[PDB]
Symmetry: C3
Subunit: 562 residues, 3 copies
């Protein structure tokens, strides 16, 4: 590795075509790609740096309801009138989610003692020996005891040490008690912060009347909601959900750009139902949970249990805030360049397809409209230089009677040449700038061939004739003796390379002979690549040998050039 090898810059080589069709196609594709990427950049705001948000939600529910119920306690039933305020139908969860009671089922006066279990469907027992001591299972309000007692006249149930009077499995009461909760109100206060952009805002703005209510079109940016409207917008019925509660969800979409020329950051409110739309025959249809209020009277602990059915609103906050940024632009321009190669790849594909040489056969005479596209063939000739790898089996042969050249890339295995065939190939056209300057063996149709002198193993390659059919030989013409066998022209060609060589040298003869071989190939096999592997016939070879003979040893043959 030398210093001169470090400064070498390597550059691709191209060809330029002046055509209206390809130019129009190229510019159309470039313009539409530019339009697409610009539209995407302007729509999606890819020039902006986007960042997620940090949210904080606070909720306040308001409303009152009345209830009238035949309540039981100590075996005494009586109609009681009660009121439910905010502190009674809500629990202090203090988060994004909040709860609202719509129906309840309570049992009061409970105290820890022995009592019979309420006989449910299939829990009857009229045998004191059937029960088992200290056995617990789900759907059981207590621990079982070996004894037995009657729950009522003509009723027999197992004893249990638990809270008594034990709660009895009841379905939810329909119509609900707190169906009036369809008229309650909510207030949702959301503060959102983009830290990276250093922006903070809130859904509430100055001047809003607090006696407002959210409507989809009338008053959209009023954070106060009505619990009936949330179900009305979707199509659900609150009076049916109240009996067996169900989960609801609110979504607050924040999408805005923190640019001075376009600064609108407002929340969009949406609603969704997360629970399954349950019906009769469903398995687990309702949302419910139990909770107790403890107390004591006359030195004895007691509780009041409440199974509460009610909705649950799961607030969901998601968004992204964008602001102008310069590096994202550069990142996008870096990506567009790969897309910009469509015209190049498409037009190259069109050329390579239309230069197949099969279209001239059938599709062109059939259609009769795509004729001038044959022009593309010319482009291929000015774009693709086809070659072939050199190998010892590579040979070329030309016959004067035929117009084309025959390549041979196969071993002989003793067979005589010109009896084996190979893929045809056409000869190239001569550079006209220089052209303007001006008895016998069985395998010879020429009559003038000679047998080979090489060994019996390698001589079959030398078996050849100038003409494949009989009638004429190449060496009988005059151009042959003018070009090849002219000693003066060959001496001139040798002087053109080495002008100071001596013409009286003894070993000069062979030198001339070598040139004569090339002087044949260039006549027939024009290309130097095709001429290095060309093989002369026997007649021309032995003519040249008799004009330029060797005496010391036997003649050699086709030596591999490398």
């Amino acid at each position: 590795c030398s210093w001169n090898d470090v400064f070498q810059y390597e550059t691709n080589k191209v060809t330029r075509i002046q055509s209206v069709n390809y130019g129009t196609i190229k510019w159309i594709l470039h313009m539409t790609v530019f339009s697409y990427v610009s539209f995407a950049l302007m729509s999606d705001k890819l020039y902006q740096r986007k960042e997620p948000l940090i949210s904080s939600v606070h909720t306040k529910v308001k409303g009152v309801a009345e209830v009238t119920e035949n309540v039981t306690e100590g075996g005494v039933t009586k109609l009681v009138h009660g009121i439910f305020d905010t502190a009674d139908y809500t629990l202090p969860l203090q988060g994004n989610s909040f709860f609202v009671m719509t129906n309840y089922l309570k049992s009061e006066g409970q105290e820890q003692k022995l009592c019979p279990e309420y006989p449910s469907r299939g829990k009857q027992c009229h045998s004191d020996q059937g029960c088992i001591k200290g056995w617990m299972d789900p759907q059981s309000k207590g621990i079982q005891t070996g004894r037995c007692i009657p729950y009522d006249q003509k009723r027999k149930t197992c004893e249990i040490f638990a809270w008594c009077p034990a709660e009895e499995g009841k379905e939810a009461p329909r119509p609900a008690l707190l169906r009036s909760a369809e008229n309650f109100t909510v207030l949702i206060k959301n503060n959102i912060d983009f830290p990276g952009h250093n922006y903070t805002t809130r859904n509430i703005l100055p001047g809003m009347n607090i006696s407002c209510t959210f409507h989809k079109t009338w008053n959209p940016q009023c954070p106060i909601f009505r619990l009936g409207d949330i179900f009305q917008e979707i199509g659900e019925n609150f009076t049916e959900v109240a009996v067996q509660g169900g989960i609801m969800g609110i979504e607050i979409y924040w999408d805005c750009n923190l640019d001075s020329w376009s600064h609108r950051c407002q929340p969009k409110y949406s609603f969704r139902r997360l629970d399954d739309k349950y019906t009769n025959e469903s398995l687990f249809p309702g949302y419910n949970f139990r909770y107790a209020k403890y107390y004591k009277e006359n030195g004895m602990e007691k509780r009041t249990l409440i199974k509460a059915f009610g909705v649950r609103f799961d607030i969901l906050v998601f968004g992204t805030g964008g602001k102008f940024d310069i590096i994202q632009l550069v990142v996008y321009i870096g990506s567009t360049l790969s897309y910009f190669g469509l015209a190049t790849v498409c037009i190259d594909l069109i050329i390579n397809t239309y230069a197949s040489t099969c279209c001239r056969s059938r599709v062109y005479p059939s259609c009769k409209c795509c004729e001038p596209c044959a022009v593309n063939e010319y482009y291929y000739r000015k774009k693709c230089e086809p070659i072939v790898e050199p190998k010892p089996t590579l040979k070329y042969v030309s016959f004067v009677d035929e117009p084309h050249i025959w390549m041979v890339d196969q071993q002989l295995l003793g067979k005589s040449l010109q009896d084996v065939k190979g893929q045809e190939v056409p000869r190239p056209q001569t550079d006209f700038l220089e052209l303007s300057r001006l008895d016998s063996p069985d395998w010879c149709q020429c009559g003038n061939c000679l047998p080979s002198q090489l060994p019996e193993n390698r001589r079959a390659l030398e078996e050849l004739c100038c003409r494949r059919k009989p009638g004429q030989c190449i060496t009988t013409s005059e151009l042959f003796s003018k070009i090849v066998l002219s000693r003066e022209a060959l001496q001139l060609l040798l002087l053109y390379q080495e002008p100071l060589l001596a013409l009286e040298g003894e070993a000069i003869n062979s030198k001339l002979r070598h040139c004569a071989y090339r002087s044949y190939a260039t006549w027939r096999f024009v290309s130097q690549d095709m001429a290095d592997f060309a093989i002369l016939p026997s007649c021309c070879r032995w003519k040249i040998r008799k004009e330029f003979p060797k005496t010391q040893g036997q003649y050699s043959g086709f030596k591999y050039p490398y």
Copy 2:
């Protein structure tokens, strides 16, 4: 398709330039790109596979406070001394967030009954008929009834069935009761898990003194905090926030690499305020909520209601853990390759710009410093081979008096040729390796042109002259008769392709005549691509025709080659 077509590998063709400037530019750009990508890989740790974390947080607040307040109950007021412990100013939320009370406002002795409403601002009523029965609205503590009663001497308000004595709307008491909460302490225990890397850890380490407090510099990794310092770090005031509570937020950043040579995983604590910086005249400035304690005495249900103002800390855990991975390296090396094309594209752009041929006119003589950059023009000649598509309208004309060639890609519409002009173009230089080998019509300035014999529609194309101005003809020279009209040289050129054709053939004459046309084009239009579409003048054409005449039919004209 063919088998020989499947093994064909297609390779791009390039040119190699030995220049110090381009080499230095190339290597500079390569080195700086390498430096940038290596710096990015080392800084961002892109060689690592990253994974998010799974967190579990637990909190414990500790501290005590005293309160002295004139409490009311049953119309009896008296000064009472009370204590607030951990179980009193907190609620069992059991999550990431937790709550602390800083101010309260309570009403005790409530019972469900009829009572008057407390007259708020604008809720006075001195008319029994004005009220409506069975009406509910927000900001109302109960259901209204048609009756009316006096709340006090000289006071008249509406009756309601609700909890009595009904709570009266008051502002938050200032100074706050639990301002002492600025000295309470917190303990935060966070456990994090990276499942994919299988790494579990915790913020607490062995040996930390439990009698520590968080400081930004003194003792950073002490998870115990002080509620006053959290506000003091930001610049807030706890005494002003205690009156109307506000939300606070703690952030715990985990960023660490699970590599054996670099293993430091420690949390970073940060603070932020999620609520708005509220002040006077704001609408909804305070965090608060209501909760109730139920009980009963002498067989009657009662409750104690508490409107609580306090802060709410929202703990936020975000992080990512990285560990060494081999495939990410490969993915990054795969991406660098597209970036590495900067030198190529930039230098090619420089060449294409400096080879515009306009710089030689104005900018070079003006600046007088970018002269040697004209060298780049040569590179263009060795890089871009320009061509033109063949079409029937395509024609080339050359006049001996002018030095350049005239292209014509436009229809004639009956106009005589050489009266219409087209874009100039220079002739290519001859391959010197071969060059070293050695009355009249109105539209002719040459005096030797002849009229055309083609039809009247298509003959105007043949109208031409050798010279555009008068004075001389081409056929008067000697090189003309040496090259074209020499029967021997043309016969030799025919033998060079088909050495066995007979010179006695009657149809050979026309053959020779065809060659003569090419022998003119190659003399003037050197390139074969240009020579195939060249057009001879009339004088030379008819000279060639008289030397090689036809008798059977009329002569044809310029046939399209393909």
Copy 3:
């Protein structure tokens, strides 16, 4: 900017190689890349648009337990038998997480008053002057007062205004009270929604027996779990965790494709422990908290405090739903194209490596197996066209005695030429299609050189000789006088370009002389690029000058061509 310069389409230029090895390598690499991308597309389902989920969880725990404990109140101890039901060991959290009590430690009969503090380890005090009034610290149940009192006979402690009888710091009681909670049951109801795909579903399906239990293999899709099995699957022990509680975690993985031909969406349940694996000597091992139950009797407020140790389950729901989408396919096909260049880059690298020209020296004779790979050199000759930039220092020299050409890109600084050396370079081969056509100064070894006439500063460049060693001159041959000094051939070469120039012109001589210089270069420096910068010796120069002399002024020298 011309119009014709807008329709110019630029196309890369290539060379096509016919080789079995490179074709096989190309197709192998293409097929394996195709296989890889297809396998990735089928495995990762990249043909689908994926979307995250929106989840809603609801829990219900069931089970009962009994406790027998020597409970204390008012200095009276007695054995008490209690029961714990669903409302007694759970708290209404109503979220993803839920809590279960496994151990408790309670203190009842508390009332706000003055009492002594329980003497802990190191909190003794036998001196009334040591205490301080109005001092609060953590680990203290109340505010300290200056007075002192005895907690018991032979015990002295500080007085405090707080809840009395004050709770005493105790360790967790082992064995736990609610170890029976290993046999409780849970029910988890999860509803998921994919909005974009518009698909709602639930883990529960019709027909499941509600008397089921989750098993990893037997009954996987039974959402009922047993709290002992959750620990048993991992390897933990519930009885050891129940004393000092710890956090557990459930994970629900939804991975499914919403395609009609493949529609299976079922949850996978997994378990994990989020808390640390704690043992003896650890610092903060347990999850616990405190909560109180308030009441009043005989007109006096009271509370019962409970320190609860228990587990906390943190349900975690993550997943992604996929459905078929057409644009993602196009996006993937767009990405594969960059990958497809492997064969091209690899084979070009192989060619550029094997064409280094160093392999022929050492590695080939050593290995003796990679000989035919030398063939690749030929490809390089058909691919890379090496050139050199023109500059005023660039010169070329050739000596007939040597076979190669010497490049010189260095300033002389007054030194005589042919005494300075430069990098060698071989001469290119002649186009054989045209080749078939047919006293003295100190620094001259030729004997025929002349001194220079240029100024003393610039004449050293002209100092040169044809032969580097003595014995022969070039101008003594016959080819020299046949090519260069032949007035007729030069006149013909001039007529070949400008056929109408007059041979009687006085200024024609110099013209011929100029041509003679070129007629030397093409003889020795075959390329036109190398010939434009070639420099003649003195002997040939002055021979040409004597055959074509100038009389008016002194002869100039080598002028820069551009």
